[PDB]
RNA sequence: GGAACUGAAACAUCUCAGUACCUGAAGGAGAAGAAAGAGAAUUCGAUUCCGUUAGUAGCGGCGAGCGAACCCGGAUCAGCCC
RNA sequence: GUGGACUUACAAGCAGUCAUGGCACCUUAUGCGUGUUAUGGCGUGCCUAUUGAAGCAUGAGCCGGCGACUUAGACCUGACGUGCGAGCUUAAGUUGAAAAACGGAGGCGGAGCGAAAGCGAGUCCGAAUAGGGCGGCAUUAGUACGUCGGGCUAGACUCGAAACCAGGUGAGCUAAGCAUGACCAGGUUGAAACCCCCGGGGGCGGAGGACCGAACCGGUGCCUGCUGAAACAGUCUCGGAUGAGUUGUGUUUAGGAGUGAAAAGCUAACCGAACCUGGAGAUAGCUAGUUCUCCCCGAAAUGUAUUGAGGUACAGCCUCGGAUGUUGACCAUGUCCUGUAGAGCACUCACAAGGCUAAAACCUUAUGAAACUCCGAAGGGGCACGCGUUUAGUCCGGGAGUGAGGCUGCGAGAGCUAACUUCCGUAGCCGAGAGGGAAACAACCCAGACCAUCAGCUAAGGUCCCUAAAUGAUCGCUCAGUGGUUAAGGAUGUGUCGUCGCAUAGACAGCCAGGAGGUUGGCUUAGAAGCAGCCACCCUUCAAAGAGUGCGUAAUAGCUCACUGGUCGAGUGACGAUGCGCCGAAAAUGAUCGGGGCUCAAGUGAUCUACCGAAGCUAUGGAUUCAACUCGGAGUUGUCUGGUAGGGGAGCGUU
RNA sequence: GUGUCCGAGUGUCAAUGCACUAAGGCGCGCGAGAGAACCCUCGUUAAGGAACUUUGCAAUCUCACCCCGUAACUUCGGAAGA
RNA sequence: AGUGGACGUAUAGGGUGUGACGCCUGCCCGGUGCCGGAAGGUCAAGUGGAGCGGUGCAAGCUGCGAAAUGAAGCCCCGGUGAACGGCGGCCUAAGGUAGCGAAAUUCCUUGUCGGGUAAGUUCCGACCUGCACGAAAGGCGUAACGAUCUGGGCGCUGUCUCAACGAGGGACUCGGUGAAAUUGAAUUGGCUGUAAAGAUGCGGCCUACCCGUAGCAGGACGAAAAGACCCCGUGGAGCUUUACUAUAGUCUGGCAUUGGGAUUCGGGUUUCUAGAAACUUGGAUUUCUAACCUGAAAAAUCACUUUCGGGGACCGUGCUUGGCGGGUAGUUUGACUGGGGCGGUCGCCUCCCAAAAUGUAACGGAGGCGCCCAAAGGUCACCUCAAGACGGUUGGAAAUCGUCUGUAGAGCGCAAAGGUAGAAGGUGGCUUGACUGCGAGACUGACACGUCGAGCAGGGAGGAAACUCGGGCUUAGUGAACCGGUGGUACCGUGUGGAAGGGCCAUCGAUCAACGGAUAAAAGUUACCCCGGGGAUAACAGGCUGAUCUCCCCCGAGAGUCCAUAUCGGCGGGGAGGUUUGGCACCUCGAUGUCGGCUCGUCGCAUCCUGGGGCUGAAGAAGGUCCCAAGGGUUGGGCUGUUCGCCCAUUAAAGCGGCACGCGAGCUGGGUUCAGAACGUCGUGAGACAGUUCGGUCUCUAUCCGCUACGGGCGCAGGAGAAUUGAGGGGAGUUG
RNA sequence: CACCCCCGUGCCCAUAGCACUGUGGAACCACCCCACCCCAUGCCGAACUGGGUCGUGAAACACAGCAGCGCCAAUGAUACUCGGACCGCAGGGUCCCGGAAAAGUCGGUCAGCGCGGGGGUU
């Protein structure tokens, strides 16, 4: 063994209560650990970036049912 | 005739360098010199030396690095003979 | 070395430091004196290299004197200063020189974008519109010098290679050759050939890389010699000693070359490539060394990359200046994100007793999990505020160094739940840190040294003597020197509670009294009969006794026992929690808690004071760094001043 | 260390060997005491005899000439100074 | 040029290896070498120049440029071993002929038996199981020879038990001369602790009047040479080869020196009734003598002439071609690494570690990638998976159909984590958005790279539309830079116009996988080693730890007929000691000498003897085992360098360990570890192994402390002679 | 939001879901109804789908009861932990302050809010 692979510094890049420019990246994820609410659009590797400038808010009933909206 | 350390963080091309060194000829100097040229204005008008153009052009395992010439400004300026 | 003051012969000692006393002296000098001295306290040379230095790590005998960050250039870059300023200035040279002027060729600013053609405050990409660099805007003014910080290139802070190359010098040592001369006492052995008697005997003869042994040539073994008598020898012993011998002279062969009966041996006393001069101050990522003083700030041993790992590049951290202007920082509120501790089996692996059944499955019950999660804190990170105390931050430009870390505690891995082990996270100390405590001691506990005082309160730690300070006070605890070195395990050790029995209808040991019944009980080997031993315990006679405890020879008896009794006269026996202790408990020169000594506490657990105790804090005096505040550095108030690499600043000494 | 030449006598089979000595030459350019440990070159050693030690390393022992006598083996010479 | 070979000429000369003599010298031509062959494969310059292009109005000039034809040489085919070699592993070209064998070769190894000694790791003779013999890198013998090595025996010895006495030269004392290595400074003790972990110098405690002198050799990690061992340096040098690169040399084709001619000519021209005389441009054999080379004659080397003689247009030399070329030369030969080597690893992806942010090391625990898919894409539309039970045709535990349960227990191309049921899974229709030009904004990184990305243009594709498309559910499927190939484009293109060449856009070439990548192009070896450094880093020793080692204790199964504990103690548990093999890497690489012996010793006690005990399965005696006990004592020899162990023969007994595995400024020097050499084994080679074997320099001068002796001074309240008490210190201590 | 009830479509986002179950009927919805063709089944008008009444509330669906199941879930007490401060050689553990789960019990629920329309009491 003695093998390993680079860190992928994934996360909630922008936490609810953070104003965001358009195109800011807010969550990094392997998949849909977050499912993108209103105003946000999710990319190829399933990072989801805000489309509209404003505050970031978490809709989060959880269990795969967590969504990131942006409010203007 | 012609190095090698060395640099290239190794090392062959490269550089170190036509350096050091050996050998020949000669003088108070020597060399060179009177355009089958530079050059791009149909200009220049022998040779040598300084400043500059200029680290420009360019050369380079296009790497380390190596590097002009013309224009222009001065020092000195004689062209003579087969 | 000579002479004089003071001193020195039970003293333990980085050579001193402060203090006190004794003696001597009085020319910056009768003092807050100079020389010396006794005693007391205190006290790990210096530098370097270091995680860490008194080190038993390096360097150094001592004093002097030489001795290391330079110079260069029409170079690049920055800070400061000066002239001129939208412009600024020369170079080569020329003419003068006890003096400098002329000299515009040329350089820099003025426009940028593009790969370039080329356009031009626009420009490249492109088919038009999205960008990049750029001007407007802040038009940030440049340039010639001087000084200085850096950079470059050249020996480039100084010393130091082993090597490489060039042209020479060497065969007078030694390695061989050639020419030519010379030397080898003496004794032993007796080949051929030649000649007689029958290959053999005799004679005769004088051969040999033959024998012994002097010179001579050579070095076999011990010893001596080992700052030698000698830079390879000496005594003694040994090899050869007519041969492949020794030796003179003259002479030839040499540097990757010669010579070599072959060791890489010899080539002028260091030959796996001589010597000398030179290239040449070769290179040196390696070592050591780098000197005057004071002020201010102050690190790093981390990340990634590397023919990289002990070295470099770029970040990270330091400093100086400019700008900005609280953006910092801690703490609080609000919010969001997380899958650890824990905890759980709901999936995956595992796994514990059963029921159920052609056992997978299934149910009751029961568990572990870094790569399991139905769950899931504490904390932690981002944002916003400041609803609150503070002073840092950000970018831009010059200079750095650091890129070897060390411990402890917490959390993990690796290891053996070893290591003053190795590798990460994290906090603090050390590095770079002085002062008090811990006998001693970078890391631990206390506490960050501006200077001066024969002033005060305290921290940790202490208060019997060493040794500063209560032989303090009160309730105990341990009689072990435990204190002042572990454990599994044992113990009628001792206090504190605490759970279970049987007693003035009289029990525990304690003395006499009885020990019974089938039954010499079934089941066993050869006999096993309270009393080897696998299987099973009911029944009679009794105020009274279990087919019944350990012993006994191999089996029964035998003295005791569990209930019974006259006596006996009052508590006992059991497992338990614990507090302090005992054993368990052997290592190497001589013992010990730092020592004395401590229970007639100087141990201990609980409380409470009173004081000692630091370079921390307070007092008086004093000076720097900064900043405000005033007058044309000064002074006030506040504040700050441990320090390695390093950066900055003010100054002293020499020619 | 250094090449060549001459290098007497007594005795001893011989000799340039060994011992004494002629000629000739010299006592080695600090001395004098003293008679410890220890060290170097030496002499003798009870009893034992290799026990020593890596090894009999070293030190003994053997010693010249003459007579007698000498093996396994042999390349017929030698081993043999058995 | 000239020389040596050689004033020699195959019975001679050169090289290579074996190494008198004797009997001998087997197998294997596959690779490598070499010698022959030379049907065919390939192969340079040169001869040829068909065609492809520029540039000019054109003549023409000019850049490329095939086919065929071109030597040696290599591929191919034989052979060669007294050529390099090979003759073994429960198919290779073959597999060991004789001879020998525990060897100079034997690891296991002190092999087994015999011999010799009281005792034999040695030695000798047999045996053979030859790790890992062997036939001219020669095998088996051999008389004689050896300062050769090994084993034995005689002889004699101070080698020794065990040393003594004597001599001389030192050594000591006096007078004369009078150095040296060294040296931080010294007012320089013992223990025990502590500190970088070995203290004179830090702590406590003990001891110690001042100073010498003769001695010793424990300490001062004493002295000496900035470790020759080990590691490091993008140090060096010597040596090696099928590392790389060149190259003296060497072979080969063509051109010149270099020529007439006959002879066969694939061909040239004007020549003539498909044709041949003048003639060749050449090639080819063959031949010739004026070039040239060489030799003989009074004129030695050289020149002349030569009645001359031989070779001969070759040989030699100049240029150029291609091959051979460790002989020479200049170099390359990676890093991490709980010391180097060996093994492993080097880039990207997934998980745990990673301590609920991101991040985080390890030669830590697990596994994947160097691709795929014309549809596994875009879009539009449509389906729902495991698994179980009941029932069923050839099948039955599981084909297939049928019902019931069925937030998933399936699937998602490969590894896993996330994710997913309104799909990313499955199945069709259409087509390519697997587009060109851009990139607001962020994530991430020191850079450089990397990730995601709304929306705009041109234009597509699917859908009725909203809308979705600039690749795949996601995360791996990858390499800057240089130098070049291919297609466009029309920017530079040196006087001008063109073109040659260059630039740009697209694309191709990389286990450069040591994966940020030194060159286009590179392996070993050093023990002949050299330099510079490192205690940054191994071998020793000390330290820390104590797995392993040594010891004790608890339990108690059983053994002990019986009876656990007289003894012994399974399977398990707890400690101690630091003597073993270690780990770790802390002081020491400007030096800490290392194994064994010898000489001196001293300490522990886990006690071999001796002394005092308890229990005993103790009658007695001899024992067993445990307790207390460290005063003393603990033998001599054979084997091996040994420690050890075995053995002889005795003992009261033949103790175990510490003290740098105590002791080399005390001694040896056998072992091991420098240069020579040989054997086996490994390597083609230089060379190599902690396998073996012979051999191989151990440095007169003691300052200090410390130790044994011997004085000087002073002290001890007068100055003196002599006798003394013993504080307190040593020696002795055994036993049959 | 007059009272109910139906069809649909949201918010919510198992305290709403399952099962047992009962009411429902031409009003709404639902099956049945037929198929050459629109349109379709990798076979079937089962599914889409196109043409409709009867019939029937069977099934599905809506709505009520329902605490067997699931779903939620205290308090209390712990586990753990931020800071402080300690002991044990060690594995380990204690104390002060404050934050504080998970599991279980107690107990809670078969929901809760809109919007448009259709038909009822005519
Ligand atoms: C004193 C006797 C000899 O001693 C020696 O040969 C002594 C040498 C000593 C022992 C050596 O040092 C040791 O080196 C070991 C590798 C390590 C060791 N310890 C510390 C770990 C260390 O001690 C040598 C190499 C050390 C130094 C001093 C050195 O190189 C000495 C050279 C000269 C020494 C001496 C020289 O002897 C020469 O011998 C010739 C035979 C004589 O003729 C003569 O030559 C002229 C003589 O001198 C050179
Ligand atoms: Mg591993
Ligand atoms: Mg270089
Ligand atoms: Mg070079
Ligand atoms: Mg010159
Ligand atoms: Mg000259
Ligand atoms: Mg001249
Ligand atoms: Mg006194
Ligand atoms: Mg003293
Ligand atoms: Mg100090
Ligand atoms: Mg160190
Ligand atoms: Mg020192
Ligand atoms: Mg020294
Ligand atoms: Mg110039
Ligand atoms: Mg300025
Ligand atoms: Mg701008
Ligand atoms: Mg300037
Ligand atoms: Mg500076
Ligand atoms: Mg700079
Ligand atoms: Mg130098
Ligand atoms: Mg002879
Ligand atoms: Mg003889
Ligand atoms: Mg010799
Ligand atoms: Mg002899
Ligand atoms: Mg030289
Ligand atoms: Mg050579
Ligand atoms: Mg020499
Ligand atoms: Mg140079
Ligand atoms: Mg480094
Ligand atoms: Mg930097
Ligand atoms: Mg900020
Ligand atoms: Mg703030
Ligand atoms: Mg857990
Ligand atoms: Mg965290
Ligand atoms: Mg605000
Ligand atoms: Mg800067
Ligand atoms: Mg580091
Ligand atoms: Mg660290
Ligand atoms: Mg472990
Ligand atoms: Mg450590
Ligand atoms: Mg370490
Ligand atoms: Mg440091
Ligand atoms: Mg600090
Ligand atoms: Mg301190
Ligand atoms: Mg202490
Ligand atoms: Mg102290
Ligand atoms: Mg220290
Ligand atoms: Mg300190
Ligand atoms: Mg420490
Ligand atoms: Mg404290
Ligand atoms: Mg006080
Ligand atoms: Mg206090
Ligand atoms: Mg006191
Ligand atoms: Mg206990
Ligand atoms: Mg008291
Ligand atoms: Mg007080
Ligand atoms: Mg104080
Ligand atoms: Mg102060
Ligand atoms: Mg003042
Ligand atoms: Mg400071
Ligand atoms: Mg301070
Ligand atoms: Mg300071
Ligand atoms: Mg004579
Ligand atoms: Mg005579
Ligand atoms: Mg005589
Ligand atoms: Mg004589
Ligand atoms: Mg004389
Ligand atoms: Mg004399
Ligand atoms: Mg002697
Ligand atoms: Mg004797
Ligand atoms: Mg005898
Ligand atoms: Mg012996
Ligand atoms: Mg012997
Ligand atoms: Mg020997
Ligand atoms: Mg001898
Ligand atoms: Mg015979
Ligand atoms: Mg005979
Ligand atoms: Mg004889
Ligand atoms: Mg040979
Ligand atoms: Mg043997
Ligand atoms: Mg042998
Ligand atoms: Mg042999
Ligand atoms: Mg034997
Ligand atoms: Mg034998
Ligand atoms: Mg052979
Ligand atoms: Mg031989
Ligand atoms: Mg002989
Ligand atoms: Mg010989
Ligand atoms: Mg012998
Ligand atoms: Mg004597
Ligand atoms: Mg004497
Ligand atoms: Mg004297
Ligand atoms: Mg004199
Ligand atoms: Mg200690
Ligand atoms: Mg220590
Ligand atoms: Mg002391
Ligand atoms: Mg001191
Ligand atoms: Mg001595
Ligand atoms: Mg060194
Ligand atoms: Mg060295
Ligand atoms: Mg090299
Ligand atoms: Mg050639
Ligand atoms: Mg060629
Ligand atoms: Mg070579
Ligand atoms: Mg390495
Ligand atoms: Mg994390
Ligand atoms: Mg780290
Ligand atoms: Mg799909
Ligand atoms: Mg888009
Ligand atoms: Mg579009
Ligand atoms: Mg359409
Ligand atoms: Mg092209
Ligand atoms: Mg490359
Ligand atoms: Mg790399
Ligand atoms: Mg040598
Ligand atoms: Mg050092
Ligand atoms: Mg170390
Ligand atoms: Mg060691
Ligand atoms: Mg060892
Ligand atoms: Mg030293
Ligand atoms: Mg030394
Ligand atoms: Mg004892
Ligand atoms: Mg006894
Ligand atoms: Mg007895
Ligand atoms: Mg003893
Ligand atoms: Mg001992
Ligand atoms: Mg040891
Ligand atoms: Mg030793
Ligand atoms: Mg030896
Ligand atoms: Mg071989
Ligand atoms: Mg031997
Ligand atoms: Mg001596
Ligand atoms: Mg002497
Ligand atoms: Mg008195
Ligand atoms: Mg006494
Ligand atoms: Mg005394
Ligand atoms: Mg609660
Ligand atoms: Mg708190
Ligand atoms: Mg805490
Ligand atoms: Mg709490």
UniProtKB/Swiss-Prot annotation:
Belongs to the bacterial ribosomal protein bL27 family. The keyword tRNA-binding applies. This is Large ribosomal subunit protein bL27. The keyword Ligase does not apply. GO terms for molecular function: rRNA binding; structural constituent of ribosome; tRNA binding. One of its GO terms (biological process) is translation. Binds the 5S and 23S rRNAs and also the tRNA in the P site. GO terms for cellular component: cytosolic large ribosomal subunit. Keywords: Ribonucleoprotein, Ribosomal protein, RNA-binding, rRNA-binding, tRNA-binding. It comes from the Bacteria. Part of the 50S ribosomal subunit. Contacts protein L18. The chain holds residues 12 to 83 of 91 of the full protein.
């Amino acid at each position: 063994n003695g093998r390993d692979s680079n860190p992928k510094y994934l996360g909630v890049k922008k936490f609810g209560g953070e104003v965001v420019k358009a195109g800011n990246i807010l969550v990094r994820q392997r998949g849909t650990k977050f499912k993108a609410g209103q105003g946000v659009g999710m990319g190829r590797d399933h990072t989801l970036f805000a489309l509209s400038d404003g505050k970031v808010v978490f809709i989060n009933k959880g269990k795969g049912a967590r969504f990131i909206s942006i409010e203007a």
